Amino acid sequence: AMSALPELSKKLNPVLGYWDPLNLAELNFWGAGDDATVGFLRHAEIKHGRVAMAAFVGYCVQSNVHFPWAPFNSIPTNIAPAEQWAQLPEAAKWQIILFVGFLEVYSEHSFILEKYGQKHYMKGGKPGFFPDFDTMVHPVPLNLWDPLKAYKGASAERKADGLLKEVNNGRLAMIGIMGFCAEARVPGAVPALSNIAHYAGDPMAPFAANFHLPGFASXXXXXX
Amino acid sequence: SSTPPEALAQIVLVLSIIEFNSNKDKWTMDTMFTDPAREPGNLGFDPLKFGENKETRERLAMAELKNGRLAMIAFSGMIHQTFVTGKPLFASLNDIFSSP
Amino acid sequence: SKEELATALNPVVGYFDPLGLATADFWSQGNEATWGWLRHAEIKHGRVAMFAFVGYIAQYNGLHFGFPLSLPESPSYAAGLTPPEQWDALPLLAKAQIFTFIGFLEFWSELGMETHYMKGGRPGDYPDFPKAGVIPVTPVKVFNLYDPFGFAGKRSEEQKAKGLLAEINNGRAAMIGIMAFLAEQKIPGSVPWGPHLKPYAGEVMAPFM
Amino acid sequence: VSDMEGTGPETGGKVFDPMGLSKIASAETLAWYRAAELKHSRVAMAAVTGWAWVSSGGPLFPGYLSVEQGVTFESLGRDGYAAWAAVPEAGKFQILGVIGILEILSESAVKPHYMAGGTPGKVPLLWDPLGFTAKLSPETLARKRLAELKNGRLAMIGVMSLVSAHFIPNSVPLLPGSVXXXXXXXXX
Amino acid sequence: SDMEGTGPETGGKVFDPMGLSKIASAETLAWYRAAELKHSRVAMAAVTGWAWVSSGGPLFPGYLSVEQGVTFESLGRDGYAAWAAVPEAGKFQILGVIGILEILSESAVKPHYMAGGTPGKVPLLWDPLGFTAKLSPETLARKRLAELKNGRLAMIGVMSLVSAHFIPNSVPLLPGS
Ligand code: CLA
Ligand code: CLA
Ligand code: CLA
Ligand SMILES: CC(=O)O[C@H]1CC(C)(C)C(=C=C/C(C)=C/C=C/C(C)=C/C=C/C=C(C)/C=C/C=C(\C)C(=O)C[C@@]23O[C@]2(C)C[C@@H](O)CC3(C)C)[C@](C)(O)C1
Ligand SMILES: CC(=O)O[C@H]1CC(C)(C)C(=C=C/C(C)=C/C=C/C(C)=C/C=C/C=C(C)/C=C/C=C(\C)C(=O)C[C@@]23O[C@]2(C)C[C@@H](O)CC3(C)C)[C@](C)(O)C1
Ligand SMILES: CC(=O)O[C@H]1CC(C)(C)C(=C=C/C(C)=C/C=C/C(C)=C/C=C/C=C(C)/C=C/C=C(\C)C(=O)C[C@@]23O[C@]2(C)C[C@@H](O)CC3(C)C)[C@](C)(O)C1
Ligand code: KC2
Ligand SMILES: CC1=C(C#C/C(C)=C/C=C/C(C)=C/C=C/C=C(C)/C=C/C=C(C)/C=C/[C@@]23O[C@]2(C)C[C@@H](O)CC3(C)C)C(C)(C)C[C@H](O)C1
Confirm if C29 and D125 have CB atoms less than 8 A apart: no
Confirm if D59 and D53 have CB atoms less than 8 A apart: yes
Which sign, positive or negative, has the C-alpha torsion E159, E161, E167, E172?
positive
Q: How many CB pairs under 8 A join A and E?
A: 22
Task: Name the residue of chain C whose CA is nearest to A215's CA.
Answer: C189
C-beta atoms of B50 and D32 within 8 A: no
Which of D64, D71, D63 shows the shortest CA–CA distance to D88?
A: D71
Neighbours of E173 (CB within 10 A): 6
User: Which amino acid, one-letter code, is at E26?
Assistant: A
User: Which amino acid, one-letter code, is at B73?
Assistant: I
User: Which amino acid, one-letter code, is at A153?
Assistant: G
- Tell me phi and psi for residue A89, to 5 degrees: -65, 150
Which of A33, D143, A141, A120 shows the shortest CA–CA distance to C14?
A: A120
Neighbours of A183 (CB within 10 A): 19
Which of A136, A67, A126 shows the shortest CA–CA distance to A105?
A: A136
Show which subunits contact E, needing at least 3 CB pairs below 8 angstroms.
A, D
Any known ligand binding at B69?
Answer: yes
Neighbours of E93 (CB within 10 A): 14
What is the rounded distance in angstroms from the CA atom of residue D106 to the CA atom of residue C25?
19
Q: How far is the CA of A144 from the centre of ligand 8 (A)?
A: 61
Residues forming beta bridges with residue B33, ordered by sequence position: none
C-beta atoms of C11 and A109 within 8 A: yes
Element holding A104 (H helix, E strand): helix A90-108
Bind-site residues of C for chlorophyll a:
42, 44-45, 93, 106, 167, 170, 172
- The residue whose CA has the least distance to atom 17 of ligand 6 is D155
**Quick one: which ligand is closest to E23's CA?**
2
Confirm if A132 and A143 have CB atoms less than 8 A apart: yes
Confirm if E151 and E39 have CB atoms less than 8 A apart: yes
Interface of E with A in 123-162 (CB under 8 A): 129-135, 139
Q: Is the CB of D129 under 6 A from ligand 6?
A: no
Q: How many CB pairs under 8 A join B and D?
A: 25
C-beta atoms of E110 and D10 within 8 A: no
What is the rounded distance in angstroms from the CA atom of residue E45 to the CA atom of residue E154?
9
- Confirm or reject contact between B57 and chain D (CB < 8 A): no
The 3-class secondary structure across E82-114, one letter per residue, is CCCCCCHHHHHHHHHHHHHHHHHHHHHCCCCCC
Beta strands in chain A, from DSSP E residues, in sequence order:
none
Neighbours of D180 (CB within 10 A): 21
What is the rounded distance in angstroms from the CA atom of residue C141 to the CA atom of residue A204?
66
The DSSP output letter for B51 is: G
Q: How far is the CA of D153 from the centre of ligand 6 (A)?
A: 9
Q: What is the largest CA-CA distance in chain D?
A: 57
C-beta atoms of E93 and D14 within 8 A: no
What is the rounded distance in angstroms from the CA atom of residue A67 to the CA atom of residue A71?
10
C-beta atoms of E110 and D14 within 8 A: yes
Burial of C85 (0-12, 13-18, 19+ CB in 10 A): middle
CB burial readout E66-91, b (16+ within 10 A) else e = eeeebeeeebeeebeeeeebeeeebe
Which of C82, C85, C73 shows the shortest CA–CA distance to C209?
A: C85
- Confirm or reject contact between E94 and chain D (CB < 8 A): no
- The residue whose CA has the least distance to atom 13 of ligand 5 is C177
Sort residue A150 into left (φ over 0), alpha (ψ -120 to 50) or beta: left
To the nearest 10 degrees (0 to 180), the angle between helices E137-166 and E26-54 is: 60
Contact residues, chain C, for D127 at CB < 8 Å? none
Q: How far is the CA of C191 from the centre of ligand 8 (A)?
A: 62
What is the rounded distance in angstroms from the CA atom of residue D147 to the CA atom of residue D6?
9
Burial of C69 (0-12, 13-18, 19+ CB in 10 A): middle
* Ligand 7 atom, smallest distance to D89 CA: 41
Which of A80, A56, A76 shows the shortest CA–CA distance to A66?
A: A76
CB burial readout D94-114, b (16+ within 10 A) else e = eeeeeeeeeeeebeeeeeeeb
What is the rounded (10 degree) CA torsion for A27, A28, A30, A31?
-140
* Ligand 8 atom, smallest distance to E162 CA: 38
DSSP string, C128-169: PP--TTSSS--S--S--SS-TTS-GGG--HHHHHHHHHHHHH
What is the rounded distance in angstroms from the CA atom of residue D81 to the CA atom of residue E30?
52
What is the rounded distance in angstroms from the CA atom of residue D149 to the CA atom of residue D158?
14
- Confirm or reject contact between D24 and chain E (CB < 8 A): no
| Residues lining ligand 7, Cβ inside 6 A | D 65-68, 87-88, 90-91, 94-95, 98
**Final resolution, Å:** 2.8
C-beta atoms of D175 and E96 within 8 A: no
Neighbours of D168 (CB within 10 A): 10
What is the rounded distance in angstroms from the CA atom of residue E73 to the CA atom of residue E82?
10
Q: How far is the CA of D151 from the centre of ligand 6 (A)?
A: 5
Confirm if C42 and C171 have CB atoms less than 8 A apart: yes
Those residues whose C-beta lies under 8 Å from the C-beta of residue B9, and which sit 6 or more positions away, are: none
What is the rounded distance in angstroms from the CA atom of residue C185 to the CA atom of residue C179?
10
**C-alpha distances out from residue C145 to C41, C102, C149, Å:** 17, 12, 10
The DSSP output letter for B49 is: -
Confirm if C121 and C115 have CB atoms less than 8 A apart: yes
Confirm if E112 and E106 have CB atoms less than 8 A apart: yes
- Tell me phi and psi for residue D15, to 5 degrees: -75, 150
Confirm if E147 and E120 have CB atoms less than 8 A apart: no
What is the rounded (10 degree) CA torsion for A97, A102, A104, A105?
140
**Quick one: which ligand is closest to D9's CA?**
1
CB burial readout B22-58, b (16+ within 10 A) else e = eeeeeeeeeeeeeeeeeeeeeeeeeeeeebeeeeeee
What is the rounded distance in angstroms from the CA atom of residue B73 to the CA atom of residue B78?
9
Which of D177, D176, D180 shows the shortest CA–CA distance to D86?
A: D180
Confirm if D54 and D80 have CB atoms less than 8 A apart: yes
Q: Is the CB of D151 under 6 A from ligand 1?
A: no
* Ligand 3 atom, smallest distance to E57 CA: 25
Chains C and E share 3 or more Cβ pairs within 8 Å: no
* 3-class DSSP state of D34: helix
Confirm if D5 and D141 have CB atoms less than 8 A apart: no
- Confirm or reject contact between B63 and chain D (CB < 8 A): no
Q: Which of E63, E124, E126 to mutate to test the interface with D (most CBs of D within 10 A)?
A: E124
What is the rounded distance in angstroms from the CA atom of residue A32 to the CA atom of residue E133?
13
**Quick one: which ligand is closest to E72's CA?**
3
Q: Which of C10, C15, C184, C196 to mutate to test the interface with A (most CBs of A within 10 A)?
A: C10
Neighbours of D50 (CB within 10 A): 14
Q: Is the CB of D157 under 6 A from ligand 1?
A: yes
What is the rounded distance in angstroms from the CA atom of residue C77 to the CA atom of residue C68?
8
As a residue count, chain B comes to 100
**Quick one: which ligand is closest to D145's CA?**
6
Q: Is the CB of D134 under 6 A from ligand 6?
A: no
First to last CA, chain C: 41
Sort residue C23 into left (φ over 0), alpha (ψ -120 to 50) or beta: left
Chains B and E share 3 or more Cβ pairs within 8 Å: no
- Tell me phi and psi for residue D64, to 5 degrees: -100, 175
What is the rounded distance in angstroms from the CA atom of residue D78 to the CA atom of residue D84?
10
Q: How far is the CA of E3 from the centre of ligand 2 (A)?
A: 13
* 3-class DSSP state of B65: helix
